[PDB]
Design a protein around this nucleic acid. Structure first.
Ligand SMILES: [K+]
Ligand SMILES: [K+]
Ligand SMILES: [K+]
Ligand SMILES: [Mg+2]
Ligand SMILES: [Mg+2]
Ligand SMILES: [Mg+2]
Ligand SMILES: [Mg+2]
Ligand SMILES: [Mg+2]
Ligand SMILES: [Mg+2]
Lengths: 260, 254, 372, 88, 253, 224
RNA sequence: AACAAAAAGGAUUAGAUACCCCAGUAGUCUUUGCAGACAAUUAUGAAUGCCAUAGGUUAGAUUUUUAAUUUAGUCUAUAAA
């Protein structure tokens, strides 16, 4: 069965300094990751996914419509742990290599800050904001910001559930609305018939998530309160998060090829 | 299967016991997977601290320390239960019993049965035995509990010695004539069970094993005997500490 | 009391395999084919599955590993074992996809199983606490005996003249002495109801001759006696003097364990079109056209009667892959013979276009290029 | 009605002719020609068509034989498992 | 909790009742295809087959492991034999652990009773207590009778009785997996178990492979201390005698 | 007796006797085989002896001359009667694939049927209802029917949530830009199309045989 | 009526009593006696106690009558022998 694993630096015991109280991280990871794994176990208790890993269940249950409920619990457990696994007990100084690509791609580290934080609030819904690394066979490494919805995964092997654009406020009769609507059916029709829209490289090496931001309410509603009056809330939660990012590890997983 | 084992006349008793030991270990279906060592760890450590004296008064005094609140032993529930038992046992039997446990350690096996025959003779004449048996077995608990010669251990003053009377031979009782003249100070073949402190100690004082390597030394030496890993692990939890760090492990005594 | 080896085998997985249940009952006096046999109404053997790492090795938890040619390659690993070891020293097995995938295709319809109705359509679930009950008390009266679905006695109308004689000779004949006692217990209620109704202004319950006379009195009214005889032998109701006593009680649970939904009263919220009026349509295949003047359609692997309304009238060899028709499954029920019968109805026009739009088959998409 | 018996031990379980020894496809055409001569006569004109069909037989090539049937190989694998044994 | 490649990558030293039941070692043949002689190991009947008692399989397996360990401890030559299709990786792995020989193809009738014909040109070598090749036996290795195994572990006795009968004639002890239809008189040490499962055959074989490995370790450890657990075979023993005779002949001359 | 004389159980006795003395009388015996001392103290086990097998069911007491005394008996448990009842009321429960392949044989260590139908390591199946029923029917003293209804109703409410979650899980995924592949309803129909065509070709090619052989039945070859 | 030793005729054949053919009387059938010989065979007298399985089949019995269990027959193929 799938069991809960400890956190990075005993966050469950002490928690982050000025980002999450030990009681909040307890309700956010222990009392929730355990709840998700209990449901995940019941769904794979007697199937081939019984001994498979979370990410393996994600890629294997991405397109199958009869396993969408299994994808949620598997993808949620993977995304949730991916969030806490990149937090540092003490602020870290951004490396030189990473500090270069961020400025070359987004213009400035402060610009990337507002883009991710701005996307978290602009999304108005529980999800995850990713910092993806895209590198086509001919093009160089390029960093962008991808925002997934409730349990969507950023990996290319699970593009079937790359839930990054709501349909209730993005598909309409307006000029931009019709464009989104066309792309909607173009994906559903292409995916259904098996055709691929964007050619990808083998092994899903195109997109490599490096950083994540969990915007679900169970992670900040208790600590930063609702947010009425401009104090705390989902806004301050995203701001304080930006200070505890493990830029040392973020740069590592990025694997920015040295060319300077 | 034991009936099929046909030894050779020229095999020593050691070889014969080795053939039977290996035959009994084939029919083992494993020990319980959840049942843990009862007398082990905290309780086992408490027994070594409370039952190391030569006076039942001091033993009970030590138990009260364990049952007291805040005792670092952590066996409050156990110490309280043992106390409620000793109070019911015959106070004379406790003195006589605790006395033979300290003397029997230096007696021979043949000399032991002869002394006990004299001791048992004194109990037939005593009052506690006839009362305890008549009150518990013949009456089946009726007529209330037993009534020993002293109502409790507090009646026996410190200077009293109610044991020597039982360890003195009686000329009216002829010496016990045994069926043979064999004897020994320690069992010649009593190492077919699980490894105990004596075995683990010898292996440590002889070799220079480590924490995990030492456990495999017995799991291999006993050829996968069920319970060796749990037993050897427990012995080290009590009588072994990293005197040399993670490199090796030695005893806690010194 | 049992050795540790016998204790493990009991809770083992292979020991938990269910026994092979008898096949779905058919016409007893009708002829059949014994050499060849097609898919059955409902499954009789358990479908088995393995891990993908084990299937490549042929290990299915059975006595021996199965051949790879006939068990590898497909998507859904499913197998039915008839004998774990036959007289040929082989595991007589077959594919279990004919029923394993028929269950998944049916549950894809997202429809419950309702109680059979008579012809004001009122679809009532079969899992209701008042109807779905099998444990009854001896005090259980007759008015509440119609709600049950599992009876101990047989359905007299369904038995053959031979099975009925064997029943009368070996089941009801040796129960005369017991039935007389059953009357005495009623007399205890007959002499106390009139003897205890005025106290607020038990009887001896053991008689020999009074019973003989009470039964004679019932000869003028045969209905009150049948209700008393059926209640003793636990016979399923036959006529109204209600719970669909036409074809008899079901030989299985009214749902048959194929679906556990309790209602279809819900709306499908479309991403762009909001809630829908009816459930999405399902494409069906035409079998045995009218030109018997009745047509048969295959919906989700089950055979049902065509909608009450061409393609369903005359065969057309020109159509590729046969004739197909979009329909909507209105009601699903389980008859007394264990079959699953669907009341299919023709699907609307706009709905078939909405369904085809997602999968990318709609010619004129309702979105974007739909000015009117 | 009883079920098929279990064969006793045989020296070998096999079918004599594994492949169907089909008949020359034209021996049937000749019979038709010989049938007309009996009813319509020899030098008649009605049989002028069947004769052309008969002449068309031998001018066409003989179909090649089919590959051997492996039935006997599989019968020899399951003999002991399907019968009461194998005779020596 | 389970990986198909576990019985090969890391076989267990001892098999428990749960390991044997999970490996399907208790599933005998159809009740009709049974050798009534081996009704002593059958626990009951279920699913139309005979169930082999799990306690019986465990006891007999621990006994065979002792035999394999002692033969390897005394410097004996062992031979693991599994001929069924999917038994090659199992037998080769077991022989590797025990430093033994393997056989995964059809046994050639006469390789023991007629070893001069079948094993005439196969090369041998002479080694000491530390398995070090000894020099000076060139004349012996050329005029010598080929070797026969000191122990044979057969994973499917029912399919090769020619091998087991030659071991009976040559007075060679044998270990076999005796299924419900196999004759238990064909081997010296029986292991009642399902021989048709590659999961049960890998466990039994892996357990016997660990036994041989554990026996070879003790033999080579005693050698480092200068204690040889075996004596020179009679074949090589005679060579020493006539060898000194040739030296004794030249002693005078 | 076609069988051969197997003396595998007497290899040690035969080998030890041949090694006792030397064939060249007057000399000490050579060294014995290396395996002789290995199994010196491990004799074979008794074989071919027919014992009284374990009686899993009480033997017939009325029998005066019982046969098949040395025949193993059938293993039957109180759950066999219960499994047959459930799976006969829920035949389509057999269509749910179940993995009888064992992992480590330690499934029964985490099964406490006093809690409910959902246990550790095993899936929610008809077996859970039988084990839960048996527990109620033995501990809480319920009857076969009463314990059946209770464990049976708990089993339905769990199955309903499983089916309701598939539909809702797919419906919400599309509300946020989630698309899926083909479903069984579509895949199942395409396979029928490809198979229906094969039948059409066979029928079209098989009907030509009858109409041709039928018309040619008459000997109209005269062409009058 | 039919069949058919015998008797007789026609053929075949080196010859043909014969095998084949055209015909044909005892006899076969009925009732009453005589007769007592048979490959009257399972080339195996009758009977009793006992010894391991498997697959069919015949007449019942029991059962959760599906199919199992069992009593008495009969046959096939084997184990120990
Ligand atoms: K005639
Ligand atoms: K003549
Ligand atoms: K018979
Ligand atoms: Mg076998
Ligand atoms: Mg006559
Ligand atoms: Mg006479
Ligand atoms: Mg006769
Ligand atoms: Mg006679
Ligand atoms: Mg007859």
């Amino acid at each position: 069965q799938h069991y809960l694993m400890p956190l990075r630096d005993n966050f469950e015991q002490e928690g982050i300094r000025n980002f999450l109280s030990p009681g909040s991280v307890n309700m956010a990871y222990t009392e929730y990751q355990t709840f998700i794994l209990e449901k995940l176990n019941a769904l794979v208790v007697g199937t081939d996914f019984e001994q498979k890993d979370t990410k393996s269940i994600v890629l294997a249950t991405a397109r199958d419509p009869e396993l969408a409920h299994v994808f949620n619990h598997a993808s949620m457990a993977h995304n949730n742990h991916f969030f806490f696994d990149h937090l540092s007990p003490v602020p870290v100084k951004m490396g030189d290599k990473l500090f270069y690509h961020i400025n070359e791609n987004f213009g400035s580290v402060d610009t990337l800050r507002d883009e991710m934080i701005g996307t978290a609030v602009s999304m108005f819904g529980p999800g995850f904001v990713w910092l993806v690394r895209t590198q086509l066979p001919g093009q160089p490494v390029a960093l962008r910001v991808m925002a997934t919805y409730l349990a969507g995964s950023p990996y290319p092997g699970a593009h079937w559930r790359r839930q990054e654009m709501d349909a209730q406020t993005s598909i309409g009769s307006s000029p931009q609305g019709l464009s989104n609507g066309q792309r909607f059916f173009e994906r559903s029709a292409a995916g259904f018939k098996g055709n691929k829209l964007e050619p990808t490289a083998p092994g899903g090496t195109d997109l490599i998530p490096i950083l994540c931001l969990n915007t679900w309410e169970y992670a900040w509603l208790r600590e930063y309160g609702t947010g009425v009056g401009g104090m705390g809330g989902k806004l301050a939660y995203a701001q304080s998060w930006w200070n505890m990012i493990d830029w040392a590890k973020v740069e590592e997983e990025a694997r920015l090829e040295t060319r300077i | 299967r034991l009936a099929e084992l046909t030894p050779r006349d020229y095999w020593t008793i050691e070889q014969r016991l080795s053939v039977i030991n290996d035959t009994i270990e084939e029919f083992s279906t494993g020990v319980p997977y959840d049942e843990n060592i009862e007398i082990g760890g905290k309780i086992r450590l408490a027994i070594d601290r409370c039952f190391k004296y030569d006076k039942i008064d001091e033993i009970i005094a030590a138990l009260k320390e364990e049952a007291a609140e805040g005792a670092k032993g952590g066996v409050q529930s156990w110490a309280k239960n043992t106390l409620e038992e000793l109070t019911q046992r015959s106070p004379t039997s406790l003195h006589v019993t605790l006395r033979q446990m300290r003397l029997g350690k230096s007696w021979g096996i043949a000399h032991t049965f002869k002394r006990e025959h004299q001791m048992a003779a004194k109990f037939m004449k005593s009052h506690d035995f006839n009362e305890g048996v008549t009150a518990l077995l013949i009456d089946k608990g009726a007529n209330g509990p037993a009534k020993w010669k002293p109502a409790s251990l507090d009646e026996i003053p410190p200077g009293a010695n109610i044991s020597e009377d039982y360890f003195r031979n009686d000329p009216e009782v002829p010496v016990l004539e045994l069926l043979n003249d064999r004897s020994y100070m320690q069992y010649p073949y009593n190492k077919f069970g699980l490894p105990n402190d004596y075995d683990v100690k010898e292996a440590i004082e002889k070799g220079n094993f480590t924490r995990e390597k030492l456990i495999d030394h017995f799991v291999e030496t006993r050829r996968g005997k069920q319970g060796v890993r749990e037993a050897v692990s427990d012995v080290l939890d009590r009588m072994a500490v990293r005197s040399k760090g993670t490199e090796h492990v030695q005893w806690k005594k010194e | 009391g049992v050795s540790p080896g016998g204790a493990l085998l009991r809770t083992s997985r292979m020991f938990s395999l269910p026994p092979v249940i008898p096949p779905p009952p058919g016409n007893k006096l009708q002829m059949i084919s014994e050499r060849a046999s097609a898919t059955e109404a409902y499954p009789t053997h358990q479908v088995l599955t393995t891990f993908e790492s084990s299937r490549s090795r042929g290990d299915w938890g059975l006595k021996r590993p199965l051949p790879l040619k006939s068990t590898t390659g497909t998507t859904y690993p499913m197998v039915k074992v008839k004998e774990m070891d036959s007289l040929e020293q082989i595991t007589d097995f077959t594919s279990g996809t004919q029923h394993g995938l028929t269950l998944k295709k049916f549950q894809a319809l997202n429809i419950p199983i309702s109680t059979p109705s008579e012809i004001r359509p009122v679809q009532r679930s079969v899992f209701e606490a008042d109807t779905d009950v099998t444990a009854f008390s001896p005090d259980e009266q007759i008015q509440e005996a119609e709600k049950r679905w599992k009876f101990s006695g047989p359905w007299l109308a369904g038995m053959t003249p031979g099975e009925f004689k064997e029943y009368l000779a070996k089941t009801v004949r040796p129960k005369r002495a017991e039935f007389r006692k059953f009357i005495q217990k009623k007399i205890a209620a007959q002499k106390t109801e009139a003897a205890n109704r005025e106290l607020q202004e038990k009887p001896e319950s053991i008689t020999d001759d009074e019973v003989t006379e009470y039964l004679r009195r019932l000869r003028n009214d045969n209905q009150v006696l049948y209700d008393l005889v059926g209640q003793f032998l636990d016979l399923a109701p036959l006529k109204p003097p209600s719970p669909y006593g036409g074809r008899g009680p079901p030989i299985t649970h009214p749902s048959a364990g194929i679906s556990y939904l309790r209602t279809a009263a819900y709306l499908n919220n479309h991403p762009i079109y909001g809630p829908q009026k009816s459930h999405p349509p399902v494409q069906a295949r035409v079998l045995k056209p009218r030109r018997g003047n009745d047509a048969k359609i295959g919906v989700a692997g089950f055979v049902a009667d065509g909608p009450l309304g061409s393609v369903m009238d005359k065969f057309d060899p020109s159509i590729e892959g046969g004739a197909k028709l979009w329909v909507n499954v209105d009601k699903a029920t389980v008859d007394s013979t264990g079959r699953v019968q669907l009341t299919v109805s023709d699907a609307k026009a706009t709905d078939v276009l909405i369904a085809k739009e997602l999968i990318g088959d709609a010619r004129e998409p309702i979105f974007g290029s739909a000015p009117k | 009605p009883n079920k098929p018996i279990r064969l006793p031990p045989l020296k070998q379980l096999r079918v004599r002719q594994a492949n169907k020894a089909e008949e020359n496809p034209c021996i049937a055409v000749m019979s038709s020609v010989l049938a007309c001569w009996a009813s319509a006569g020899y030098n008649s004109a009605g049989c002028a068509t069947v004769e052309n069909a008969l002449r068309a037989c031998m001018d066409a090539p003989k179909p090649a034989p089919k590959p051997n049937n492996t039935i006997n190989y599989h019968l020899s694998r399951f003999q002991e498992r399907l019968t009461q044994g194998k005779s020596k | 909790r389970y990986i198909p490649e576990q019985y090969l990558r890391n076989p267990p030293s001892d098999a428990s009742l749960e390991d044997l039941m999970a490996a399907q070692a208790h599933m005998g043949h159809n009740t009709s295809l049974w050798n009534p002689a081996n009704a002593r190991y059958i626990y009951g009947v279920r699913q139309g087959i005979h169930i082999i008692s799990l306690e019986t399989t465990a006891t007999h397996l621990r006994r065979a492991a002792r035999v394999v360990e002692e033969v390897a401890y005394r410097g004996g030559l062992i031979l693991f034999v599994g001929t069924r299709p999917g038994q090659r990786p199992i037998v080769v792995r077991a022989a590797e652990l025990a430093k033994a020989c393997h056989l995964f193809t059809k046994w050639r009738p006469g390789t023991i009773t007629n070893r001069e014909q079948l094993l005439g040109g196969v090369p041998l070598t002479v080694v000491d207590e530390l398995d070090r090749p000894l020099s000076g036996f060139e004349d012996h290795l050329h005029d010598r009778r080929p070797l026969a195994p000191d122990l044979v572990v057969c994973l499917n006795p029912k399919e090769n009785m020619t091998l087991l009968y030659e071991c009976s004639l040559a007075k060679i002890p044998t270990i076999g997996i005796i299924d419900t239809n196999t004759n238990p008189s064909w081997v010296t040490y029986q292991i009642p178990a399902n021989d048709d499962s590659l999961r049960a055959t890998a466990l039994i074989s892996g357990v016997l492979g660990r036994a041989g490995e554990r026996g070879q370790k003790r033999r080579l450890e005693a050698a480092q201390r200068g204690v040889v657990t075996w004596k020179t075979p009679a074949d090589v023993q005679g060579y020493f005698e006539l060898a000194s005779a040739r030296a004794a002949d030249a002693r005078r001359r | 007796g076609k069988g051969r004389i197997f003396q595998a159980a007497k290899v040690y006795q035969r080998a030890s006797e041949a090694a006792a003395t030397n064939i060249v009388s007057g000399l000490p015996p050579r060294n014995p085989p290396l395996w002789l001392k290995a199994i010196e103290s491990i004799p074979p086990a008794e074989i071919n002896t027919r014992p009284y097998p374990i009686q899993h069911s009480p033997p017939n007491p009325r029998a005066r001359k019982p046969r098949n005394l040395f025949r193993p008996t059938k293993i039957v448990y109180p759950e066999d009667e219960l499994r047959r009842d459930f799976y006969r009321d829920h035949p389509w429960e057999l269509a749910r694939p179940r993995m009888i392949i064992e992992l480590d044989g330690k499934d029964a260590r985490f099964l406490d049927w006093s809690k409910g139908l959902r246990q550790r390591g095993i899936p929610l199946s008809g077996e859970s209802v039988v084990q839960r029923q048996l527990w109620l029917m033995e501990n809480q003293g319920m009857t076969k029917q009463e314990a059946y209804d209770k464990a049976r109703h708990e089993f339905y409410k769990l199955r309903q949530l499983e089916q309701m979650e598939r539909r809702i899980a797919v419906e919400e995924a599309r509300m946020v830009g989630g698309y899926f592949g083909k479903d069984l309803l579509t895949v199942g129909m395409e396979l029928e199309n490809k198979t229906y065509e094969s039948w059409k070709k066979w029928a079209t090619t098989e009907i030509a045989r009858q109409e041709s052989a039928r018309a040619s039945m008459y000997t109209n070859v005269v062409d009058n």
